[model samples]
Target chain A: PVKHVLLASFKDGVSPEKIEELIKGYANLVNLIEPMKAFHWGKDVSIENLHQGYTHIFESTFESKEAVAEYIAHPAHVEFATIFLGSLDKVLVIDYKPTSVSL
Target chain B: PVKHVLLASFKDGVSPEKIEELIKGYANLVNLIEPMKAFHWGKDVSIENLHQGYTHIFESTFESKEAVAEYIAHPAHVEFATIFLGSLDKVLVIDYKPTSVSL
Candidate 1:
């Protein structure tokens, strides 16, 4: 089940090519986390009303709180976090023991 | 007066240094959008219980819906958007007039 959902938006002028490049670099890092039940990262399309500055989303799933917690304190995560800790904003987490949101 | 906020999380084991590098790459593009009032993009630093995956946040502010709408229609944004539209996931946006959060 999805324990957390992430969203991020960028400036309009930022080029698509640049976006692709960054995602690739980050993907390399994501491909490695341990104990994850499932995960997916991708971009966001304009919603019904269209929004600004938000352009990407990433979701992570874990079998239990222990699994998610391990991912957080994992030494490898600390290494990866140093990569972009300075340029992020807005986060939401839903940690119900029950499966949340329909796929 | 932030009008919108975006959040995103990534796979663990992703390098922190790599994260910062990608952020700088995209920051170049954001520096250019037209009709934009303000934006702040940064990473998430695990609060309280240390949630999993989520590690970044972005906020965009506009004078009104028209200003934000114009940003979406802007060609520059479209080009920048193509950069990472296909590889992102888990996006969230909130737009409210009259100043919502206090910093």
Candidate 2:
């Protein structure tokens, strides 16, 4: 599976209700979008300096790169980005295949 | 649960054997550490501009901030860092709690 991971912190003054709407909005899209395999997110609870200022992590999986393209272009995603991008101070995203492990 | 997500790419020419050794060494530590709840990882497969250049992602879970503290200070983790930090070109980490959802 291809995982798209997003790390972000909401901008100062962004209401908690908005954050809730943002997550729920995405959750709703998972049902409507054909390519979305799964989606999950959460708040920063790191106990170290590694997180910097980022406070949330959002992760979703798709069947392939093509599915990912479809997901990105999907209307629901476009609308969600407007709210998400507007609310974050800085965000970092990394797309990667699951690492290979040796037995 | 709290998740510590690591996004990284190997420096050019780092041997796969060395990377394998690094992962194995850390896998061994997960067994040795009391706070570590889980460990998993993968490579980027984004179909968009999100990944930048990061090729790999590493995620591990801990019980609490104190547990994260212990895991970081543990000798095994310190040693693993020597190999992991030395091998990557660039890395980013974020820690977060699983986001809340409305039913």
Candidate 3:
């Protein structure tokens, strides 16, 4: 699967309620976009000061790079991204094909 | 589970063979550290140009934040980091408790 990872820090003055709503919208993309298979997210909880200012992480999984491209261009995603990106002070997005290491 | 995410870019002259060895060492931490459950990684394949210079992603799963702490301090991990950090030009680490969003 292709992993779509997003790291973001919200702009100052964005309320927790607003953040929740944005995340809910992000989560809902799976329902609206056919190729987006899963979504998981969380607030940063590291003790190591290595986050470089990112405060939240969102991960989505798709079957392939082509599926990811479809998700990126999907209308629901495009619409949600406007509000989502506006709320962020900074963001980083990366996609990868996971290679699992067996123990 | 606590998710440990690492994004890194290697120094310009680092060889691919060295990078593979470093990743193998990283994956082996799952065997040496009791609480480190899984390891998966990939080179960045993002086309969106938002990675902010990171070239690879490493993800490790742990039972809890305490487990993550144990993994960090484990002798094998400590020894590995000496070589891993040396090969990187830049790195970002973040830990989070994943919240899955069901459709």
Task: Specify the highest-TM-score model's number.
Answer: 3
Recovered share of real interface contacts in candidate 3: 0.82
- Which residue ranges in model 2 land beyond 4 Å of their true spot? A100-103, B100-102
Strongest candidate by lDDT: 3
Give stretches of model 1 more than 4 Å off: A1-103, B11-18, B50-52, B98-103
Chain B alone vs. reference chain B, TM-score for every model: 0.65, 0.88, 0.94
| Candidate closer to the true structure by DockQ (higher is better), 2 or 3 | 3
Candidate 3: where is the Cα deviation over 4 Å? none
lDDT of 3 by residue, A7-98 (tens): 99999999999999999999989889999999999999998899999999999999999999999888888888999999999899999998
TM-score of chain B of 2: 0.88
Q: How well is each residue in A1-96 modelled by candidate 2, as lDDT tens digits?
A: 787788777899988998888778767777888898778898776655667577888888877778888888888889878877988897777776
- Give the winner by TM-score: 2 or 3: 3
Per-residue alpha-carbon lDDT of model 1 for A1-103, expressed as tens digits?
3244444554445567755554554444445766655544555433434433445655555666677667778777677655433344433343433211124
lDDT of 2 at A36: 85
DockQ of candidate 3?
A: 0.83
> For candidate 3, lDDT tens digit of each residue in B2-97?
999999999999999999988999898888889888999998898899999999999999989999888888888889899899999989999999
lDDT of 1 by residue, B1-103 (tens): 3244444554444466755544554344445765565655655433334333545655566676676667778877677655433333444454544311123
